[PDB]
Structure formats: C-alpha cells, structure tokens
Design a protein around this ligand. Structure first.
Ligand SMILES: *[C@@H]1O[C@H](CO)[C@@H](O[C@@H]2O[C@H](CO)[C@@H](O)[C@H](O)[C@H]2NC(C)=O)[C@H](O)[C@H]1NC(C)=O
Ligand SMILES: *[C@@H]1O[C@H](CO)[C@@H](O)[C@H](O)[C@H]1NC(C)=O
Ligand SMILES: *[C@@H]1O[C@H](CO)[C@@H](O)[C@H](O)[C@H]1NC(C)=O
Ligand SMILES: *[C@@H]1O[C@H](CO)[C@@H](O)[C@H](O)[C@H]1NC(C)=O
Ligand SMILES: *[C@@H]1O[C@H](CO)[C@@H](O)[C@H](O)[C@H]1NC(C)=O
Ligand SMILES: *[C@@H]1O[C@H](CO)[C@@H](O)[C@H](O)[C@H]1NC(C)=O
Lengths: 272, 97, 91, 25
C-alpha cells in the first residue's frame, strides 16, 4: 500500500544562477601544476538551476519528475537529513528495471531491481517500542521486488553523528552521469555560512562510487524522508510529519572546460 | 663494419681514412630484462564455500535461489577436490576461465 | 615488482615500457596513474601497497667515437650521449 | 638569468648540452 499525495495547483519553479559551481574530475589521473583542457559533460558555469521546494509551508508535498538528459547536478542544505533517497529508471514500475539509492544511519544500500515504485512515494520512519529506537523502512517506496541483479552495502556519506551544529550548516553536492553503461556518482562536503545556498566559493568534486550497471536511464525522481506523527496513548490518529527542506537540480551539457591543477593534484579554479 | 668502433666510423663516413673530430655512428638502446605484471588484491571471493558447505538444503520443488554478483570468482577451489560424483557443465569448459 | 630496473610493466588497465623507481609525489585517495605535459604516463600507483612509482623511459642515446685521426694513431674512445655508467654494456 | 623561465626528455627526442657551458660564457 502507498499513501498518495498530490496537489492540483503546481508550485512554480524558482531559479538561481549557481555561481561558479559544478566541477568534477573528468578522470582519475594525476597532474602537478598543469593547466589541462578536457572535452566532457560539465554544468555550465553561469546557467539556470531549478530550486525545488520538496516541502513548502500547514505544509505541502511535492517530489516532481525531473528528466535526466545524460547528467544531473544535485545539491541541498538539509540539516536533519530530510533528503535520503534517489530514484532512477525508465518507467519506475514493475514493467522495467529501476535503480533505488537509499541510505540510513548505518550503511548505504544500492539496489537495482524491477522495482514497483508508488506514484508519490516517501520514506517513512516510526518508533519501535520493542527496539526502543527509530528505524527506517524502504517498503513505503516499493511494494514488490523481483529479478534483483545488484546488491551493495557501503559506508554512509550523508549522515553525521554530531547532528545539527546551529548556523554552521553544511552543503552537500552530487553529480550523476551515465556513460558506456556505467552509473558514476560524485560528491563533496563543504561548509557554508551565507544565507544563499550556493555560494561563490569554488571547490572540486571527488568521486565516491562507480556502478557497472547497464540500464537505460532517461528519468529520475528524488525522495524525501518523513517522521511518524506520534500522539498521546489516549488519542488515535494516522499521519506523518517532517521539516521543510529544498534541493537544487541542474542539467549537465557537453562543454569544453579548462581545469587548473595545483602541485598536490587538487583542482583550484576552472573557466568555461 | 661491426668489429671495431673505428671501423664503424669508417663505414658510416664511407671512407678508408677518418679526420680528427667527432662522429655519430649508431644509436644505443637498452632492453627490458623481463615483463612484470601487477593487479589489485584478491578480495570479496565468490561465496561458493558458504553455499556448497551449507548445513541444510531445500526441497527440489521449492529450490532456494542464491544471487552471486560483483565479486571475484575462483573455480580452482571447486574442481581441485576429487570429492564429487558428477561434474557436468553446459556450453563452457571448466578449464577455460 | 622490481625497482630501478628496465622492465615491461603491465599495470591494471594500462600497458607500457619504462623503469620503476621510488616516488615522492603524493596522489589523492581516488586516483590511479599520474601524468604530465603532453599526456604521457609519468607515474603509476601500486594497487597492492597504495604506493606510487615514477616511470622513466628506457635509457637510450646515440653513440660517438673519439678518433684522433687515421694517420696519427688507431686508438679510439666511444662516447654515449647521456647514459649512467652502470648500464652501458646492455647493447 | 632569474628573469627567464619556461625542454624535457621523451620517447625519441633528446637535448644535447652546448659545448660552452654558462660559466665559461
Ligand atoms: C593487499 O594484500 C597484501 C598481501 O595480502 C597486503 O600486504 C600487506 O601489507 C601490510 C602493510 O602494513 C603488511 O604489514 C603485511 O605483511 C602485508 N601482507 C599481508 C599478508 O598482510 C596489502 O596491504 C593489501 N593491500 C590492500 C590495499 O588491501
Ligand atoms: C491515490 O493513490 C493511488 C495509489 O497509487 C493512485 O493510483 C491514485 O491516482 C491516487 N489518487 C489521488 C487523487 O491522489
Ligand atoms: C601540498 O602538499 C605539501 C606537502 O605535503 C604541503 O606542504 C602543502 O601545504 C600542500 N598544499 C595544499 C594547498 O594543500
Ligand atoms: C568445505 O569445508 C572443507 C573443510 O574445511 C573444505 O576442505 C572444503 O574446501 C569446503 N568447501 C568449499 C566449497 O569451500
Ligand atoms: C696527420 O694527422 C694530424 C693529426 O694531428 C693532422 O693534423 C694531419 O693533417 C694529418 N696529415 C695528413 C697528411 O692528413
Ligand atoms: C649513476 O648511478 C649510480 C647508481 O647508484 C648513482 O650512484 C650515480 O649518482 C648515478 N650518476 C648519474 C650521473 O646519474
């Protein structure tokens, strides 16, 4: 069973120019104090990025479909790990295979099967009286899974044991690609201080995990995490609550890029 | 033209006498001693041991299915032991991994 | 592996000829083989011990003969253009 | 001398030192 949530009126898409952001290492080769020119697919230096409101304030819910177009930029300024899951595939039903990328406090699970995704799926967590703790269930997103051709357990990259530090929020950026039947994911953790989510500071993006899965990918959809609404023992109600969060989605494009490598091999600056 | 360096200069200059000076006669190039190879470690071996050495089995009509992927295979540990009755394959030689 | 000896290395994913020596340059935890200007394989990281090795083309050069002249003597002296004295008798 | 900055060895290319070194020049 899936909980359905749609709104007749659609929130208009916001915009942001995403100053000088979205550069990753095209390869895994090392150069020392060299300026190298590469021909690959990068986010344009000054382009239009769509700032989506996953939850808008009681509160509105929306995780709209975003076309892939051989590359997607992703970043957010979540503080309570609201954004947890990624969904890629062709039709996101049992008809064809699909990719689910989810993570919890323990480990990351990457799993490609003939997933039967709900039309409006969200991640739900509830308190376990027997375990005296909180756990996560991925059955809220998919009901039945068959022909599972890939399993993966890895260290988490999104959660921290420290928790919220206050105004010292941390910005996380991801970049996905699909070349030669390989699903490549990049990431980078960078602190921020300014109110605007994407600052002028430029930082490289380091590879995290490569996946040798051959699947036709043309559509992707983001996922959100929600907490169970708990009331007094004398009251009985069903609902889910979560904090407001937002994320940025930009589309890559074939461009010619010049990257400046320092002596130690870390990218310091680039020009379009 | 292949016995003494002076004769090599004589051959390269195409003369029986050589004037005082310097001349470049041949190119000297070393060769590798042997060919070496290197590959990453042997980690995440195929879980054939945990399956073949299982404590209990399942019924034929309800045969259990195990999925093995994204891991290194080592078939030597399979055919090495002469403790089997029927070793049959379809479409692939065990010795041509 | 063998160090400071000309060998035909075949590392993971790339093949070439050269020499293997101790390194001082440090890679990043996600990189495999270094490079330099003109995009030639300059260094390769060892997949086993997470160590780096520089790659240098095999020693080579043109020979030259010091001849005082046929009419003055027969003694000669052979000169290699740029070779360390340890690896002269190879060819 | 300190105002002039950038010749490397390669597969088939070499560089020969000049007869007159910088000190003798
Ligand atoms: C790959 O495997 C080799 C051998 O199994 C590992 O070599 C060990 O390296 C450590 C370094 O501290 C030595 O103390 C050991 O004596 C070496 N041998 C063994 C058997 O452990 C090597 O570390 C492995 N590399 C990776 C990246 O896993
Ligand atoms: C309600 O949920 C079902 C189950 O996915 C879905 O088929 C249907 O379109 C939803 N309707 C509305 C109005 O949200
Ligand atoms: C580069 O590496 C050297 C040697 O470890 C170090 O002294 C220097 O601070 C590093 N530079 C940067 C920008 O990290
Ligand atoms: C099962 O265990 C025995 C005893 O250690 C061992 O000799 C044999 O190789 C094992 N079989 C497999 C398939 O690992
Ligand atoms: C004999 O050799 C000397 C080398 O010192 C040379 O200068 C001289 O020209 C030679 N004689 C003849 C006749 O070539
Ligand atoms: C030649 O190789 C030896 C070997 O150790 C070394 O000690 C010496 O410094 C080298 N000389 C030159 C000019 O490279």
């Amino acid at each position: 069973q899936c909980v359905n949530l749609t709104t007749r009126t659609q929130l208009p898409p916001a915009y942001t120019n995403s100053f000088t952001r979205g550069v990753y290492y095209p390869d895994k080769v090392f150069r020392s104090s060299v300026l190298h020119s590469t021909q690959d697919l990068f986010l344009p230096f000054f382009s239009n990025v769509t700032w989506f409101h996953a939850i808008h304030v009681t509160k509105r819910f929306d995780n709209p479909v975003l076309p892939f177009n051989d590359g997607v930029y992703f970043a957010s300024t979540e503080k309570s790990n609201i954004i947890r899951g990624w969904i890629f595939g062709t039709t996101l039903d049992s008809k064809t295979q699909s990719l689910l990328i989810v993570n919890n406090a323990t480990n990351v699970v990457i799993k490609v099967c003939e997933f039967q995704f709900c039309n409006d799926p969200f991640l739900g967590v509830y308190y376990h009286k027997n375990n005296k703790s909180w756990m996560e269930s991925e059955f809220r997103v998919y009901s039945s899974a068959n022909n599972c051709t890939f399993e993966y357990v890895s260290q988490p990259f999104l959660m921290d044991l420290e928790g919220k530090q206050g105004n010292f929020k941390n910005l996380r950026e991801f970049v996905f690609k699909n070349i030669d039947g390989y699903f490549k994911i990049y990431s980078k953790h960078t602190p921020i201080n300014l109110v605007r989510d994407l600052p002028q500071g430029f930082s490289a993006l380091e590879p995290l995990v490569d996946l040798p899965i051959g699947i036709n990918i043309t559509r992707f959809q983001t996922l959100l995490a929600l907490h169970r609404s708990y009331l007094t023992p004398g009251d009985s109600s069903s609902g889910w609550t979560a904090g407001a969060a937002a994320y940025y989605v930009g589309y890559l494009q074939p461009r010619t890029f010049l990257l400046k490598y320092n002596e130690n091999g870390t990218i310091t600056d680039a020009v379009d | 033209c292949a016995l003494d360096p002076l004769s090599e200069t004589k051959c390269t200059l195409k003369s029986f006498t050589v004037e005082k000076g310097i001349y470049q006669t041949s190119n000297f190039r070393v060769q590798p001693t042997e060919s070496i190879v290197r590959f990453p470690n042997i980690t995440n071996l195929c879980p054939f041991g945990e399956v073949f050495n299982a404590t209990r089995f399942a019924s034929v009509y309800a045969w259990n299915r195990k999925r093995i992927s994204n891991c290194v295979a080592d078939y030597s540990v399979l055919y090495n032991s002469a403790s089997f009755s029927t070793f049959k394959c379809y479409g692939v030689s065990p010795t041509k991994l | 592996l063998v160090k400071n000896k000309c060998v035909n290395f075949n590392f993971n994913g790339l093949t070439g000829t050269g020499v293997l020596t101790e390194s001082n340059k440090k890679f990043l935890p996600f990189q495999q083989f270094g490079r330099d200007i003109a995009d030639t394989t300059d260094a390769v990281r060892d997949p086993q011990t997470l160590e780096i090795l520089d790659i240098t083309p095999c020693s080579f050069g043109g020979v030259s003969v010091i001849t005082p002249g046929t009419n003055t003597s027969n003694q000669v002296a052979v000169l290699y253009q740029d070779v360390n004295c340890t690896e002269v008798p190879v060819a | 001398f300190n105002k002039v900055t950038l010749a490397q060895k390669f597969n088939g290319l070499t560089v020969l030192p000049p007869l007159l070194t910088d000190e003798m020049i």
